[PDB]
């Protein structure tokens, strides 16, 4: 009837905090995982309710905290954005990266890849946005903000490549701007968040844009009408966001647990809240990054004490 999520595993391979996990659309058997501890870790999803087996590779190439990792659909390559103005073009088999980047003055905060595999966007903490080639060449800088930037997202162009690519950004000046690539221009200005914008993701259809900051203001947006349909108050601090790829469930990663919603109507199914031991109660660990399956049937959640737990989407009884 409903999506209950029982505990299916636990990963222990880090000593920072995780910063971005990454699944492959093609390959359902691995997991890319990045963390604060200057490491990149690619996993092996050995389906077992005692553990999940092998972190098959490690990538020792950086000097500080990395922020977000991205990859191809089949699992061909991997990218990394570490705080020391560095970007690396990794393989997935050996560990040998390709080319570092010289393009910023700050932490490179968020990057993304087009599915046509031609341009790589980059937004960094020095209030500028940069695009890169596959061989790694500068094309155009982009300005417009005045505070920092947190996340940048490319639109899911599921309309059979009808020259429709656009970049949406999560700044830090309580501002959400939309940036074209084909014409290289501001597209839409999104207004309404009152504090530091923390995260944004759009629908897997590329149609419904969710945005939520520090106060817990989940403000929904459309792709074309681009309006404030739902303005949910998450009454907490949310760090990252979550969209079910196949279904219509939008989820949020608050500091007080894990909350889930349906698109229509409003169904608070579960609070994914794990269990710990040995704490004065002002010290409960909490997650910051989470990810779905390739079919939306498993959910991952990495936490501050380097535990990554997994669940499975079975029907409610």
């Amino acid at each position: 009837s409903n999506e209950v999520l029982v505990l299916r595993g636990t990963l222990e391979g880090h000593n920072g905090w995780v910063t971005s996990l990454a699944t492959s659309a093609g390959q359902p058997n691995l997991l890319l995982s990045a963390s604060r501890d200057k490491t990149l870790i690619s996993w092996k999803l050995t389906g077992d309710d005692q553990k999940f087996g092998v972190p098959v590779r490690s990538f020792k190439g950086h000097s500080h905290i990395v922020q977000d990792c991205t990859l191809t659909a089949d699992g061909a390559y991997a990218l990394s954005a570490s705080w020391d103005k560095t970007l690396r073009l990794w393989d997935v088999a050996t560990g040998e990266t390709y080319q570092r980047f010289v393009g910023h003055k700050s932490d490179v905060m968020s990057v993304d890849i087009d599915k046509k595999a031609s341009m790589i966007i980059s937004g960094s903490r020095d209030k500028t946005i940069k695009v890169w080639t596959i061989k790694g060449q500068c094309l155009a800088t982009l300005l417009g903000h005045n505070d920092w930037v947190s996340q940048v997202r490319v639109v899911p162009n599921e309309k059979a490549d009808d020259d429709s690519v656009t970049i949406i950004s999560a700044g830090n000046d309580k501002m959400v701007k939309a940036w074209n690539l084909n014409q290289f221009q501001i597209e839409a200005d999104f207004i309404g968040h009152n504090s530091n914008i923390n995260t944004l993701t759009a629908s897997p259809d590329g149609t419904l844009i969710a945005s939520a900051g520090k106060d817990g203001e989940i403000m929904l947006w459309n792709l074309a009408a681009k309006k404030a349909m739902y303005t949910l108050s998450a009454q907490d601090e949310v760090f990252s966001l979550a969209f079910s790829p196949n279904r219509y469930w939008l989820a949020a990663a608050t500091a007080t647990g894990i909350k889930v919603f349906s698109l229509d109507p409003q169904y608070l199914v579960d609070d994914l809240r794990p269990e710990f031991a040995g704490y004065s109660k002002a010290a409960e660990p909490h997650a910051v990054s989470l990810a779905w399956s390739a079919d939306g049937q498993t959910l991952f959640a990495g936490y501050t004490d380097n535990v990554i737990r997994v669940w499975q989407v079975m029907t409610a009884n």
Binding site: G13, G53, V54, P55, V56, R57, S58, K60, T94, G95
Partner: protein, 127 residues
């Protein structure tokens, strides 16, 4: 070509570079087999990285190390610093991580200073 890596280990200004290659398994301390080191009492200190994991993983390796500096005592500590951390570079470039950590846990359960060198430099006097 051949899987090959370099490590190095220091103690009290005494260096010990290492060259790892692949072969039947030869462990060469400055152009000599390892079973001939002149502080005969400390002969088993160099045996400790080998005698922790079993004699198995070495029919596909080749080890040539050379040292400079230090006295006749520190160089015994310097060689087993580079050798023990020299084995993991195979298992952090070629062989997987589950094979890496099991001996990582095996070393540092027994000796923290087999992986991480000491930090106890000398000191200036009447100044």
């Amino acid at each position: 070509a051949v899987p090959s890596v370099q490590t190095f280990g220091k103690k009290k200004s005494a260096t010990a570079v290492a060259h790892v290659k692949a072969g039947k398994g030869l462990i060469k301390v400055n152009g000599s087999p390892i079973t001939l080191v002149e502080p005969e009492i400390l002969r088993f200190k160099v045996y400790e990285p080998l005698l922790l994991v079993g004699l198995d993983k070495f029919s596909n390796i080749d080890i040539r190390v050379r040292v400079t500096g230090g006295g006749h005592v520190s160089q015994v500590y310097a060689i087993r610093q580079a050798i023990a951390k020299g084995l993991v570079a195979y298992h952090q470039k070629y062989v997987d991580e589950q094979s890496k950590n099991e001996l990582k846990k095996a070393f540092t359960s027994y000796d923290r200073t087999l992986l991480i060198a000491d930090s106890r430099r000398p000191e200036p006097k009447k100044f």
